[PDB]
A paper describes a structure:
As the virus buds from the cell, the viral protease cleaves [name] into several fragments, including the capsid protein (CA) that then assembles into the mature capsid shell (core), rendering the virus particle infectious. The CA portion of all retroviral [name] proteins folds into two separate domains, the N-terminal domain (CANTD) and C-terminal domain (CACTD). In mature lattices, CANTD interactions form only intra-hexamer and intra-pentamer interfaces, while CACTD interactions are also involved in formation of inter-hexamer and inter-pentamer interfaces. Our results show that, like lentiviruses, [name] is sensitive to [name] in vitro and in cells, where in the mature CA lattice [name] binds in a pore formed in the center of the CANTD hexamer.
Further analysis of the different hexamers forming the mature CA lattice in polyhedral CLPs revealed that despite the deformability of the CA hexamer, local symmetries exist in the lattice. Aside from the C2-symmetric hexamers that are also observed in regular tubes (and are surrounded by only hexamers, Fig. 3b group V), a fraction of hexamers in the polyhedrons were surrounded by either two or three pentamers in a symmetrical manner and hence followed C2 symmetry and C3 symmetry, respectively. In contrast, the structures of the other two-symmetric hexamers highlight the structurally dominant influence of the pentamer, where it actively defines the conformation of its adjacent hexamers. Specifically, the two CA monomers facing a pentamer adopt an arrangement similar to those two CA monomers in the pentamer, causing an increased spatial separation between the CANTD’s of the hexamer. This observation was further confirmed via the structure determination of a small set of T = 3 icosahedral particles solved by single-particle cryo-EM. In T = 3 icosahedrons each hexamer is surrounded by three pentamers, which causes the described threefold-symmetric distortion of the CA hexamer. The similarity of the C3 hexamer from the T = 3 icosahedra (formed by CA) to the C3 hexamer from the polyhedrons (formed by CASPNC and [name]) suggests that the structural deviation from C6 symmetry is not due to the presence of either the [name] molecule, nor the absence of the β-hairpin, nor the SPNC region.
Residue numbers in the entry:
A (entry chain E), B (entry chain F), C (entry chain D), D (entry chain C), E (entry chain A), F (entry chain B): 11 to 148, 152 to 229
The structure:
Amino acid sequence: WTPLEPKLITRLADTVRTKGLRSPITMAEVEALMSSPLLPHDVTNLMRVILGPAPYALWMDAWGVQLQTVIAAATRDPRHPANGQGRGERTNLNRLKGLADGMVGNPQGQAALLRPGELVAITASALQAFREVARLAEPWADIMQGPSESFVDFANRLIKAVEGSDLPPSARAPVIIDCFRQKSQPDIQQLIRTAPSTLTTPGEIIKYVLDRQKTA
Amino acid sequence: WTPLEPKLITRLADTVRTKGLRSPITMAEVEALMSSPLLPHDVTNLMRVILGPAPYALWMDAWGVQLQTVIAAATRDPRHPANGQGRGERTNLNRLKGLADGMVGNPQGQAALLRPGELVAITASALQAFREVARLAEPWADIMQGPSESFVDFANRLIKAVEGSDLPPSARAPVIIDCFRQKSQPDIQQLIRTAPSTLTTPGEIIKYVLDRQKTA
Amino acid sequence: WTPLEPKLITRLADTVRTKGLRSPITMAEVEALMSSPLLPHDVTNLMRVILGPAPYALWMDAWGVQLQTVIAAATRDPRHPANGQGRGERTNLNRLKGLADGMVGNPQGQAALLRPGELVAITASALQAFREVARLAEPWADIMQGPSESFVDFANRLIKAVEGSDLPPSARAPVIIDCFRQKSQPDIQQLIRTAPSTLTTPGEIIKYVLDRQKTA
Amino acid sequence: WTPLEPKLITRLADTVRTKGLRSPITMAEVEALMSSPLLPHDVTNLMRVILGPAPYALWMDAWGVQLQTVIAAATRDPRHPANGQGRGERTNLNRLKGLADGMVGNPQGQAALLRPGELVAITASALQAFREVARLAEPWADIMQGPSESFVDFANRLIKAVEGSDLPPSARAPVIIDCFRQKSQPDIQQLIRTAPSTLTTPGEIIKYVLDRQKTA
Amino acid sequence: WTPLEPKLITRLADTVRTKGLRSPITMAEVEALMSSPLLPHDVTNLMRVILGPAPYALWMDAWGVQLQTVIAAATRDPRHPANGQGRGERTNLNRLKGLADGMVGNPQGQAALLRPGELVAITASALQAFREVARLAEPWADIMQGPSESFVDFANRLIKAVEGSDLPPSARAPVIIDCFRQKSQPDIQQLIRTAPSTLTTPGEIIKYVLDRQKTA
Amino acid sequence: WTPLEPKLITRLADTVRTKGLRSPITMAEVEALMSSPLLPHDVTNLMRVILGPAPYALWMDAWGVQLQTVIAAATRDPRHPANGQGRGERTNLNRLKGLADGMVGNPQGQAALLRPGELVAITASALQAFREVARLAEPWADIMQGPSESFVDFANRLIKAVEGSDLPPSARAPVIIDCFRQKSQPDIQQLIRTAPSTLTTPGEIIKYVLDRQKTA
């Protein structure tokens, strides 16, 4: 086990302190420090340092919930990269949260007994939990394209607010499309309306509008 | 599998944030971080971090299209460095996009089953897709030299707009020359017209005009 | 013997100077510079540089007390990794504090005669002493949510004061919950009281209150 | 022999230029760059660069005096880590100051003939000389605890001024205690007076006061 | 082949952006990044990134002209470090500009087939071309030594303006001498006039004046 | 042949630009970058980059003179580490300045044919030439302590002007002492005169005066 640099952690903590939890630069920095698969000890201490007390409590809750969803999917499929073929390799939440025997407080033993699939699952779970808490701590139907705003900025803002909301995953694309059509001030509205082809995806709509947009 | 440094990724993300997607320094930095053959996981997370939501959607589209062209060329030639000799090594798009069995979400298994030819093909495809999206996201025949503008500023603006346009590479120099001759208000027009030597390159025209220009 | 970098020591000293002795980032940095087993000379000079005069006196006291507890456990078990099997390898406090013969002021001789078990015991003792002094140097039942204060600030302040106090670790969550319920002015008190679900964690209470709070 | 980085030396010189010679950050930085045992050449050039001309003269004087005290202790004990067992290894001041044969101006030969005990003795002597000159270049009985000042700051200031003064080493602890008792405004005066135990050490007094102090 | 760091290239580009092309600090930085022999790909991309469009066109022109002079000298001497002994190693401009077979667009193959003499000749040619373009993008006979200016600054400015001008190489030293004698306000004029020795070189004049100058 | 880092060269150039040629930190940095034996190409380009035009001319002159002295000593002793035993290894100035056959402009061939003794002799010659030019490019007996000036400032100024002058090294301390005694306005003059001890060192005089000075 090799610890993360306290210099990088200090820089990330100051980034979270000045920019906040939800800025795209902060999420990019977290993705950067979330590159190599981390042990539960690493992620736990990282969130202890970069997050305040109340966001840290929220993040512990969300991380537990996401890990429980992962363990449900694992008991729903014996071919999980964290699982094994026999029943003796089934992964309990004590092993994921670092609470199992031979792991409590010891990162070396942790790194010894853990699987790489276990590590990547823990890491993805922690990233999703961080996203949830960031969206929770500090409205997509109120988003309009400003008179002077470009279209890529409007699309970025709208997709961000729609994907970071309470909608089901299967309802985001139709909502994004129908918001492109009704928001996005009447020049682009008419540009999308008079589309000789049928656009059935936000990416296709974005490409079409970027091609035929009024250069100004 | 070894992940890319989040420090390099953060620096590249800030480069894309300040300079944009199309600057030659940004493309050089991307080529730098595109040096070793990356696994689909690496490139996917890299584009997730450095690109905004809408450019990321566009890039996913373009990457899929380029990979499909690659797979068409692969079924058109059984000697692809990603293919094998027998039919059992034919490479499906699920294996290229990282969607095949034993690869979904697991970078270690990905690195296990993938071929080096597969990796370099994926990498070249991703680079071409990035170029397409950069050219797509953010008029040379409307550029005139202002009455008060200097000539080097006009030349910079014109060369920028001509090279960052939809012209073929072999048509930029003649267009730049003929735009120097017809734009560039009539004092410099007559200065270029009465050139005892024949100027056959934008650099030579710029040098001549800078030598014989009316100091004012 | 190889000395620690004065650059790392200077950075750690400035960290202690700005963040204080008790911040989790400071303890993480100390754990980082406490990774390899240090000789008494190293830890002594490190604490001389990073700590002020009075905290250094306190730390010398605490380190002596912890080393004495270690030596009592060592005379209570002849199988200490610092001890040997015969009586001639029993470790005296002069050998632990670096005061024994051939060690006073000489780090090379120190590194020569010392055991790895001796080094790790000295290191753990010094870490525990640092924790004690940090807890000692610089009231949770008096914390109320102000009439104009938001709830996340109140939760941050309360969790800080409860975790940085003299309570056992197993008594912090119930106290934080019961302080959320009785402090946190009667609007939020009634909001928590009328919870159709049972909230059994500070994170869950924080999430619920943030969801259903009166936007104002 | 490997030279110290001129970048670190430049940073240390600017630190000495802005903060002064006596600041605790400056002494910490000097301790940092005084980590590995330096050859007389290294310390001499370091003090030549970081110190002005007059402080450098003072430091040469003080270094000579401290080295002479070291050589007196060495002739008073044939078991010095710089000495040897026979009389042929006795260390002369020409060998300590780098003036001996085969060493004058040559750092490689210096590093060849010098002992590690010689190096650490030279280094400790130079550090003590730096402390003396810093205390000399730019009053403990005039120190009072301000009405708003905390007790650890007052203790730090008092111990600093008492240890960096002209008192004998055997008279510092009683003076520090009796200054804690008579300074340290009457609340802490009465707190120390009504001590059911007898406090016979500055560390014990500091611990007691920090325990029973009026939180405010 | 190893690429240059995009961090160094970004710093150099910002240096060129703020200080300009002709500042001595910029030329020093270019000399720094021109230390190891670069392949045509490296220098071409470097000038593409650090220079604007019009200076880049000018630089391509000047680089071609200087490489043509080099190839003329090469056909004038079969002992060029880029040439070989037989006629089959004669170096064509397609091989120098990176246009030869097996080199177009491929830096690895470039580094494979190129000679070290080829690399150093290309590098020196590119440096001279950069100097020409910098002197061209933004008068010696108008330079006077100011009443308060020192003599070394005046000599630096004069030698810079004379060597970066349109004079033949064999006419710079006499002009520099005769400008030292007639400029360089009458105190130094009389100091040079009453020289018991005959000064026949700018360096000798500078040395003499620096020796006998009026300290003030 | 491996080139020096342009980053180190840029840092050294900025050091020379801010601190000057004669500062002890600058000479230390030059000694640092003069550690490994450099080829004539390396030293020539280094001095071209870090020095201005006129100091570079002066340095070329001084380097030639010092190399000529070296070659005179070499013809005065056939056992020079640059020479050989037979007459066919005698080293000409064309081989030292890098002007010999197979070396002009080619650092690789240079490194091939040159001897290590040749390299170290060239390096020492270049260092001595740099020292000469630095002493030449930029009065102690006119220094008085101003009526309002402190004594440490006067001592700094005097020691600076005496050590940076044309006196032999063995004549600086007596001159500094006798200038302390006769300058340093009559209050300090009488303070030094009535010294019950004999002060035989500038540091001792400075310490005595700082102790017994009239606080004002």
